[PDB]
Every structure is written in C-alpha cells, then in structure tokens.
RNA sequence: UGUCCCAACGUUGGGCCCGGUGAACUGUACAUUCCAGUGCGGAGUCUGGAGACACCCAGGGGGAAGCGAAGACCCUAUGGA
RNA sequence: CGCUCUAAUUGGAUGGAAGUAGGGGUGAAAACUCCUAUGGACCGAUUAGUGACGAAAAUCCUGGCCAUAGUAGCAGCGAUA
RNA sequence: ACCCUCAGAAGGGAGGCGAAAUAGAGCAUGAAAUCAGUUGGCGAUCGAGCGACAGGGCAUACAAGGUCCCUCGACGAAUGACCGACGCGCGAGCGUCCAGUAAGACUCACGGGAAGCCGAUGUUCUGUCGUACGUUUUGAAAAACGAGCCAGGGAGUGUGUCU
C-alpha cells in the first residue's frame, strides 16, 4: 500500500496543468510522482527458490 | 634541482613495418567526434552517444552536416586498435607481481591511479630493471 | 556567505566586508562598478554626492525604464541609490579604519577590489486578488572590499 | 578623391552589363577598377521599355526602403553590385575597390574592354545612361 | 442638451522624473527586419532580392495565425448522466 | 557497454579510497583509463548470480534557479490632510 | 580570549584553537542551473537550428599525448600531360609520334628546421552542407502537439495455467 494512502485526485483539464493526482496541492500516488507508489517493486509472492 | 621522471620514459616499441604503417594510418585518418545529436543545443543533453531515433531526425536520415552516425565502417585497423599513441600495447598494473610476464619491447605499463606512493615506488623501480616503460611515471626533483 | 575572491598581500593591503545586507543587489553592482579603482577618500566623497543627489550612479545593466542623466559620462541612464550607497560608506568606514589601525594611510589607499554578491533572499509573501499569494522578497547582499597602497 | 586604380575602364559606347560583368570579375581577382564616362555607357533595346523598368525601380519602396539610384553614377555601380556577393567579406571588399565616375577625373584615358563595345553605325535601338537619368529626374550635373 | 456637426479650455487623481518597497503572467532555440516566392496551400528562421552601426526613453497596440482554457460548435466512442 | 547487491577467485587504499572540477590517452560506440586540484574513508577486477538497472520529452513529479524587473502595485471609494 | 572598528551581544578587521575553520553552527563532500568579479577569443557596417567536416588567426606552466614543417631522393594505383615534329579541319579545334613517358595520393630515407612547436583544448574567421528534438501524420521548420532552465525522481512486474 506504499504510496496509496491518499485520496489524491486529478483536476483534469482546465487549470493548465498535467492530469496528475494531487492532494493539498501535492502530486501523489502515481509512479512519476515523488512520494508516489513504486511501479514494479520487489514482491513477497515471488518464488525465489 | 629539477623534475625528472622515473623509468624508461623515452623507450619506443619495435613494430613490424605493417604495424607502424597501420599505426600511422589510424593517426592520419582519425575519426569524427561522434557526439549525440544536438548535445550542443541543450545543457541537459550530454555528449555521450545515443543512436538518433527520431523518425524525422536529420542525423538519422543522414543529412550532410548533421554529423556521422556510428557504423562499423569507422573501426580502426585490427592490428593497431587500442594501442597507445607511442605504439605500445598497454598493460594495467596494480602491483609488482602484475609486472611479471610483461614484454618491455612490446608493452608499456600503466599503474592504476588507486595505487599509493609507497607501492608505486617499488613497482616503478622493478619495471625499469625489467626494461619496461611506465606510461604514468612519478616525477622526482633530482 | 562569501570569502574574498581575490588574493591580498597582507603587508600592503587592507580588507572589509558587508554581510547579508538587505538592500538592492542591482544597485550594489552599479556602485561597486563605479568606485573600483578610486581612492577610499574619492569613493567616499563620490558616494556622499550620490546621496546628496549631485552625482548619478551609471546604471549600465539594470537600466529598464531608467531616465537619462546628463551628468552620466559615456552612458545615458543613471540614478541615486542612497540606501546601498550608505551601506558602502559603512564598508569604506570599516576598511579605512582597519587600514589605519595597521599603520597605513587609510583614505589614500586604492580600492583594488570591490564586488557585491547576492547571498540570498529574505522571503516574504503578499496577498493578491483571487485568493492567491505571491512572493514579496528582500535581497541579501555580501560585499567585499580590498584596499591597497598606491 | 584619388583612387589608385590598377585599371581605368572607359564605358563610352560600351554595353553596361557586359562591362559590369568584367569589372566584377576583375575586382574579385583583386583589381582596383575605375569606370569612367558612366553617363556615356550604353544599354540596348527600346528606350520606352527600358525606362519603364528603371522607373518601376524608382517607384518601388516602403518603410524598410528600396533606395534605387537615379544618376548614371549610381545606376552603374548598383549594376556591378548585383554581380558581387556584396554581403560577404570578400564580396564587399571587391565592390569597395571599384568606383564609377561621371566624365574622366583622370589624366590617363581609360581602356575599352574587349567585347563590350557597341557600334553606333550598326545600332539604333539603345539608350544612354545619361538619357535614362534625365528621364528619371536626375540633375544633369555631368 | 457637446449624442452629433467639431472639437476646445479648465479641475482632481494617475501617468513622467527622484528615494524606499517590490511581485506576477510568460520563456524549445535563434531572433535588426522588409518585399515576393516556396512550403502540410496563413514563414522573423527555407529561396531570391531589398534594407540594416550598437544601446536606451516615452507611446499607441499592426504582427508573433500574442498570452490565458487538452473547442463549448460538428462528428466519432459497441463513453457518462 | 554501464548500475545495485550476493558468492567464489583475486587485488587496491591515510606513502590518501569513493565523489567532484579541470585536463591527457584508448574504443565505431555504450563506455574505459590516466594526470592535476579538491577530498578524507573506503574501493575494485575476473567468474557465476541478483535485480525497485540506464531519460530530453509524458500541459510528467519534487527541489533549486535565471530572464521577466528595479518593472506592475504602494493613486481612483464623497473620509483629498 | 584580548585588541581595533561600529549606535552595536550585529557585522567587519586583526588574533587564538585544530591535521583541517575553504570543519565556526541545516558547520563531511559540495555537481548543474545560475550570480558577482575576472582571464582568453570575438565585438558598435552587419543576419538567424546555434553545428558537422576542411582549413586559417589568436590564446596555452608542469603532468597524463609527441609529433609536425621544408629541399631533395625512393616507391609510384587509377589517371595522365606540356613542348616539339607530322598530318587534318571553313572554324573553335583534332589526329599520329614523343608516351602510358613527365606527373601521380600514401609511406619511407638523407639533410635542414619548429616546441605554442604538432596533437589537443578555448574562441573566432573562411569554405561546403545545414529551417532543432520527440510525437502525431500520406505529408512537420511548420501558423499541428510538448517543454522556461538544471539536478534528482519517473514506465514489460508477480502468481497460476498453456505453448
Ligand atoms: Cl566490430
Ligand atoms: Cl536581484
Ligand atoms: Cl523606399
Ligand atoms: Cl552576398
Ligand atoms: Cl538597331
Ligand atoms: Cl600507407
Ligand atoms: Cl518489453
Ligand atoms: Mg514512495
Ligand atoms: Mg549539452
Ligand atoms: Mg521609466
Ligand atoms: Mg478571499
Ligand atoms: Mg479536447
Ligand atoms: Mg452539443
Ligand atoms: Mg446514457
Ligand atoms: Mg577470478
Ligand atoms: Mg536518473
Ligand atoms: Mg524519447
Ligand atoms: Mg516592460
Ligand atoms: Mg558543508
Ligand atoms: Na494518508
Ligand atoms: Na515467495
Ligand atoms: Na544593460
Ligand atoms: Na551622458
Ligand atoms: Na553626459
Ligand atoms: Na539590354
Ligand atoms: Na525606389
Ligand atoms: Na463635454
Ligand atoms: Na502589437
Ligand atoms: Na505546466
Ligand atoms: Na583554431
Ligand atoms: Na502527438
Ligand atoms: Na518535429
Ligand atoms: Na506551417
Ligand atoms: Na515562472
Ligand atoms: Sr473541456
Ligand atoms: Sr589517486
Ligand atoms: Sr538591461
Ligand atoms: Sr570570365
Ligand atoms: Sr535570407
Ligand atoms: Sr502602454
Ligand atoms: Sr527505473
Ligand atoms: Sr526573480
Ligand atoms: Sr494619498
Ligand atoms: Sr480604485
Ligand atoms: Sr581570523
Ligand atoms: Sr609509373
Ligand atoms: Sr531531470
């Protein structure tokens, strides 16, 4: 759930801004966002044997 | 009273005629810079080479003036490729034992930068006695 | 903060510095530029004349909208930055003071080196229309001065 | 005011364009040329159509400006400028070592360049630079 | 009856110059342009000419198909309400 | 070719490691390497592996910063001080 | 610490400590963007994808590169003469012989020379070519879309099954 604990939403078109989820004026959740989730991180379910 | 470099500083390797010829060719022909397209137009774009991939790229399309594109045809002569300009083949050395098996007539030695002064002194005096030139010699005031 | 950016022979030189002064950085470049090479005493008289309004300071770089001044030589735009001038008078006061304490003829020394450097901004915020606020800052300026025997 | 010309060309009864072409050629080869008797230079064709063309050039213009010369002096020099890359260093240099004159300010007579001569006994459809200038409204100072 | 013929003079606050304070919009790059042409047919940047010494102040806004808003019109989506 | 960490084999470092800056050499190239200054404690090579492994771009994200600019505003309200 | 300066517990100067204060308080290192001062090159008559490749100017402590230039001679691929003689053409000019000769890129040897001198690096000038990049597109310099600049961040991953 790292990076997913936020209700951040995108404003969409209109304010001359990239459609990126934001909360309190901060971009969040998405992989390109600082403090966002890891896109393809190490996973516990992976069989390493 | 003046700085002097240790070792066989002026030593030259002995090359077959064909090798001296090819070494001379490489040096005369040279090659283009081969820097990345438009690296000069944007600071965030470094000089390190990257194949131009734009569908419309002028360099990719091979337009005269946009610089040469890396191709095998630019390779240097096999017989000389990699040689130090002096003609010597270089051998990376980290200690005195690395000097073993090195032919001073054909190879010159390059002491890794990490190596300290104490160990460099030993390596430098052992290479000279072995008739091996050291490309990056220590300068002492003699 | 800065460090003197030029070498100085202690035996024939005297130094001084201003720190984090809240004054126009742009005015400081203009003033430094104008007094360099002058004598401490000449610089002082010059700056007093600027504050008095009898001598304009050439504004050669930060000159947009600035009106021409007949007394400006070789250039057109100039002004009378009294605030930054007074700060430079404190610098010269300190400099010449140090110079004399060392046995030199303070006022007589040449301003060998003098340069202003922007060390930062004291940040401020100003409420604007439409529920937004924008920057309203103060420049922070360091300035170095090296006096040297003729 | 004194012009050490290596060559003094006499444009009298000579086809302007043909002289201009040779003076440009020589100027580019480093020669300093003085064209004399410009008002007497000549241009073949119907006087009425020739003048219309030069009148159109006088009328063209705007704020940016299209300053076209009216004196035979300048007409000829502009003609030469059109055969020189006057905006290039070498071209401006050549052009600047060329001068045209009304009458002959020299004591030495000019020479008639081969192939540029017009024979009045065999031609009737031609005009004179002086005539053109007068029509254009120039002040016949020559 | 200054809405108009047809505009004038005046008043107060700005505007302009000086001290202090001191933002924002906008910025691929280059950029002194003009006339024609060409080009995905609506070019400061391509071609040909023309013009062009650098910098600065004030101005009214012709152009940058100016800036501001992933066109609201129209159609399309095995979209929504 | 380059990056991380693991293992085996094997090396470098306070007689100055990594990093950074400027500079020399090699390689078609990814990139490798040396010199000098700074720095003041760690750093490789080969082989077999491991992978949150390579950016110029997404009106991409966050931080920092320049031009804009000593520019707009600090006048306008029946309360001109 | 002490002293000097100052309206001054500010700041500055000098000084003391320590291997180091360019370790003096968001105080290990200290990139880029970018700012001040300054060095080299260019610069107030001249033109715009900012360069690539050639070639000139000017600039250069050492180290890590050491070459380069001129006479002559040797070798000498494709190519390839002048002149002279003879013979044709109205003419421009051509043919035959001289002759596949002289010449001919590179490379080398002898003799002489250069050390800012050769390379290289900075900048500038000349020549040739040249209207970014990525994307959308039949067609992009585009008056189609994206970005102010830099640094860092930023996209084929796991389980199961199948082939
Ligand atoms: Cl290969
Ligand atoms: Cl500022
Ligand atoms: Cl005109
Ligand atoms: Cl030209
Ligand atoms: Cl006739
Ligand atoms: Cl060869
Ligand atoms: Cl993939
Ligand atoms: Mg995270
Ligand atoms: Mg770049
Ligand atoms: Mg103004
Ligand atoms: Mg409100
Ligand atoms: Mg839309
Ligand atoms: Mg509708
Ligand atoms: Mg519905
Ligand atoms: Mg091994
Ligand atoms: Mg990265
Ligand atoms: Mg890309
Ligand atoms: Mg403005
Ligand atoms: Mg620090
Ligand atoms: Na939360
Ligand atoms: Na597992
Ligand atoms: Na200026
Ligand atoms: Na003046
Ligand atoms: Na004046
Ligand atoms: Na004619
Ligand atoms: Na005209
Ligand atoms: Na009225
Ligand atoms: Na306008
Ligand atoms: Na944006
Ligand atoms: Na050069
Ligand atoms: Na697109
Ligand atoms: Na494009
Ligand atoms: Na277009
Ligand atoms: Na901004
Ligand atoms: Sr909309
Ligand atoms: Sr080292
Ligand atoms: Sr300015
Ligand atoms: Sr000719
Ligand atoms: Sr043009
Ligand atoms: Sr206006
Ligand atoms: Sr990644
Ligand atoms: Sr700013
Ligand atoms: Sr008031
Ligand atoms: Sr108001
Ligand atoms: Sr001290
Ligand atoms: Sr031969
Ligand atoms: Sr970045």
């Amino acid at each position: 759930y790292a990076g997913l604990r936020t209700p951040a939403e995108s404003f969409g078109s209109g304010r001359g801004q990239a459609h990126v989820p934001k909360l309190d004026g901060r971009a969040r959740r998405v992989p390109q966002a600082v403090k966002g989730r890891s896109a393809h991180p190490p996973k516990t379910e992976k069989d390493r044997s | 009273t003046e700085l002097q470099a240790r070792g066989l500083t002026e030593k030259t390797p002995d090359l077959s005629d064909e090798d001296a010829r090819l070494l001379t060719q490489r040096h005369r022909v040279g090659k283009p810079q081969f820097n990345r397209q438009d690296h000069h137009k944007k600071k965030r774009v470094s000089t390190s080479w990257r194949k131009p991939r734009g569908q419309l790229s002028k360099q990719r399309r091979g337009i005269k003036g946009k610089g040469d594109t890396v191709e095998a045809g630019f390779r240097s002569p096999t017989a000389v490729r990699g040689k130090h300009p002096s003609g010597f083949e270089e051998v990376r050395v980290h200690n005195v034992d690395d000097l073993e098996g090195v032919d001073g007539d054909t190879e010159a030695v390059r002491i890794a930068s990490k190596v300290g002064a104490r160990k460099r002194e030993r390596i430098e005096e052992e290479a000279e006695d072995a008739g091996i030139r050291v490309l990056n010699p220590t300068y002492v005031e003699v | 903060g800065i460090s003197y950016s030029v070498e100085a022979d202690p035996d024939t030189t005297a130094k001084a510095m201003l720190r984090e002064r809240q004054m126009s950085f742009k005015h400081s470049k203009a003033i430094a530029r104008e007094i360099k090479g002058k004598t401490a005493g000449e610089a002082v008289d010059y700056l007093e004349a600027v504050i008095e309004g009898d001598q304009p300071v050439p504004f050669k770089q930060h000159n947009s909208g600035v009106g021409h001044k007949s007394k400006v030589d070789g250039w057109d735009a100039g002004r009378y930055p009294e605030k930054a001038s007074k700060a430079f008078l404190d610098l010269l006061e300190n400099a010449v003071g140090n110079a004399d304490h060392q046995g030199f003829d303070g006022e007589a020394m040449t301003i060998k080196h003098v340069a202003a450097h922007k060390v930062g901004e004291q940040q401020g915020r100003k409420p604007r229309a439409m529920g937004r606020a924008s920057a309203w800052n103060s420049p922070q300026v360091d300035v170095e001065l090296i006096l040297e025997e003729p | 005011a004194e012009f050490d010309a290596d060559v003094i060309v006499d444009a009298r009864d000579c086809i302007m364009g043909r002289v201009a072409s040779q003076v440009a050629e020589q100027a580019l080869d480093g020669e300093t040329v003085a064209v004399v008797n410009a008002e007497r230079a000549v241009i073949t064709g119907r006087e009425e159509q020739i003048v219309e063309k030069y009148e159109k050039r006088v009328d063209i213009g705007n704020d940016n400006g299209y300053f076209y010369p009216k004196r035979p002096d300048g007409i000829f020099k502009r003609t030469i400028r059109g055969m020189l890359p006057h905006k290039k260093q070498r071209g401006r240099e050549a052009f600047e070592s060329v001068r045209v004159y009304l009458g002959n300010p020299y004591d030495e007579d000019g020479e008639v360049l081969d192939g540029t001569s017009l024979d009045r006994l065999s031609n009737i459809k031609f005009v004179t630079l002086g005539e053109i200038s007068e029509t254009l409204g120039a002040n016949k100072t020559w």
Side-chain angles (χ1 to χ4, degrees):
Chain A
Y1 273 111
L4 292 177
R5 296 132 172 163
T6 181
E9 292 213 308
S10 178
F11 289 85
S13 295
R15 41 179 60 199
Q17 213 142 38
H19 301 183
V20 175
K22 282 176 180 182
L23 205 85
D24 301 349
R26 236 102 234 305
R28 258 151 192 52
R29 186 185 301 112
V30 299
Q32 73 271 40
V34 170
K35 303 306 299 285
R37 64 188 268 259
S38 178
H40 294 299
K43 300 171 186 171
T44 244
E45 318 81 287
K46 182 191 189 177
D47 185 349
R48 297 150 202 278
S49 71
Chain B
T1 307
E2 74 172 304
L3 293 172
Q4 303 253 305
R6 296 174 178 161
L8 311 178
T9 255
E10 300 306 319
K11 192 171 177 180
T12 295
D14 41 313
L15 303 162
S16 67
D17 296 305
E18 195 56 10
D19 278 19
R21 182 175 126 296
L22 294 190
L23 183 64
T24 290
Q25 192 175 93
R26 185 186 84 179
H27 173 265
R28 178 211 324 132
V29 175
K31 61 183 166 190
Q33 300 182 66
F34 284 120
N35 292 318
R36 188 177 182 183
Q37 83 180 322
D38 300 331
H39 77 270
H40 61 101
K41 291 174 174 165
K42 210 69 165 171
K43 291 195 176 185
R44 65 165 182 270
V45 177
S46 86
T47 215
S48 182
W49 178 265
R50 295 275 153 38
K51 181 192 192 183
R53 312 250 194 174
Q55 299 294 137
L56 303 169
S57 177
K58 302 306 167 300
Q59 187 184 76
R60 182 192 127 290
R61 289 167 44 193
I63 283 163
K64 179 191 289 172
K66 296 307 179 175
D68 290 298
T69 232
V70 167
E71 285 182 291
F74 283 90
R75 284 286 226 172
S76 59
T78 280
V80 166
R81 191 181 300 168
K83 285 183 187 179
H84 177 273
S86 68
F88 273 116
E89 280 286 4
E90 293 194 4
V91 185
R92 188 93 186 298
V93 85
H94 304 279
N95 55 224
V96 183
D97 302 278
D98 279 329
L99 293 178
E100 194 167 59
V102 170
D103 171 12
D105 289 303
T106 267
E107 311 171 312
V109 87
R110 186 154 231 138
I111 304 171
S113 51
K114 248 187 221 166
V115 178
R118 175 197 297 126
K119 188 163 295 178
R120 268 178 67 79
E121 185 176 56
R122 288 172 192 162
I123 293 177
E124 281 183 287
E125 72 183 312
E126 211 80 309
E128 172 155 12
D129 280 299
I132 305 174
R133 169 183 168 184
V134 166
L135 299 174
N136 65 319
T138 297
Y139 284 75
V140 183
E141 16 39 60
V142 192
Chain C
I2 67 175
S3 289
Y4 296 88
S5 60
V6 172
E7 298 186 60
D9 183 317
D11 293 326
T12 70
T13 231
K15 308 169 176 182
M17 267 199 281
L18 286 183
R19 296 291 197 187
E20 295 185 287
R21 280 309 192 92
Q22 293 189 66
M23 60 191 196
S24 163
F25 175 51
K26 297 181 177 195
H27 291 174
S28 296
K29 303 181 201 191
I31 293 169
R33 162 176 296 130
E34 194 58 16
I35 68 177
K36 184 190 177 182
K38 290 189 173 181
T39 279
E42 306 175 308
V44 173
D45 294 319
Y46 172 73
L47 296 179
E48 301 190 319
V50 170
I51 297 176
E52 228 43 51
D54 305 323
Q55 217 56 45
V57 172
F59 277 21
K60 313 193 67 177
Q61 173 169 176
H62 302 291
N63 57 343
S64 53
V66 182
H68 295 179
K69 302 285 177 290
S70 66
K71 289 189 192 178
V72 165
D73 213 67
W75 189 247
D76 45 21
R79 269 177 180 174
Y80 316 92
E82 57 110 32
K83 186 173 178 183
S85 289
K86 294 178 182 173
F88 273 75
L89 282 177
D90 285 341
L91 183 65
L92 290 166
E93 171 171 62
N94 187 70
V96 177
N98 298 170
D100 296 325
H101 182 59
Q102 294 168 46
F104 290 116
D105 185 344
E107 306 192 310
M109 272 169 277
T110 304
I111 296 177
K112 180 196 178 190
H113 183 226
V114 57
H117 302 78
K118 185 169 188 180
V119 149
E121 288 199 321
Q122 170 177 279
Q123 290 174 295
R125 220 65 195 170
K126 170 81 67 179
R128 296 277 227 145
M130 317 313 295
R132 125 206 207 188
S134 62
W136 201 261
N137 311 325
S138 315
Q140 294 186 306
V141 180
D142 273 22
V143 42
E144 41 164 349
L145 172 69
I146 302 175
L147 294 174
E148 175 181 53
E149 285 185 290
Chain D
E2 297 186 66
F3 193 58
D4 271 310
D6 300 308
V7 192
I8 297 182
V9 175
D10 182 274
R12 182 166 188 154
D13 293 326
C14 293
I15 296 167
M16 180 194 242
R18 283 170 189 280
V19 172
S21 176
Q22 299 193 212
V23 177
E25 165 85 297
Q26 290 191 44
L28 281 175
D29 285 318
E31 301 290 357
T32 290
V33 185
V35 181
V36 157
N37 298 319
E39 77 276 3
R40 282 179 150 154
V42 114
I43 167 184
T44 308
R46 232 183 88 221
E47 181 168 2
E48 290 63 46
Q49 88 86 0
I50 290 171
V51 174
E52 265 189 56
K53 185 177 187 183
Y54 284 82
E55 287 179 307
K56 183 57 174 182
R57 294 176 171 181
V58 164
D59 292 321
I60 290 177
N62 45 40
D63 290 322
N64 185 266
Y66 195 94
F67 141 67
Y68 193 77
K70 301 181 190 182
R71 305 234 272 78
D73 215 355
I75 299 295
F76 209 135
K77 187 137 192 202
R78 178 58 70 84
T79 295
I80 293 167
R81 206 189 71 175
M83 293 174 199
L84 292 176
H86 63 292
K87 277 174 183 164
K88 285 186 174 185
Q89 181 196 61
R90 188 174 99 301
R92 183 184 176 185
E93 266 156 44
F95 182 60
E96 264 164 46
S97 53
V98 167
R99 289 193 190 168
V100 188
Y101 302 83
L102 295 176
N104 193 161
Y106 296 90
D107 303 322
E108 184 185 320
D109 296 67
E111 63 173 291
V112 174
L113 301 170
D114 264 279
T116 76
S117 201
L118 177 76
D119 178 17
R120 279 169 176 276
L121 303 192
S122 301
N123 296 287
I124 244 169
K125 294 187 73 169
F126 71 86
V127 199
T128 264
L129 274 204
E131 296 174 300
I132 293 173
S133 292
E134 287 187 66
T135 299
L136 297 179
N139 187 317
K140 181 172 178 174
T141 176
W142 58 92

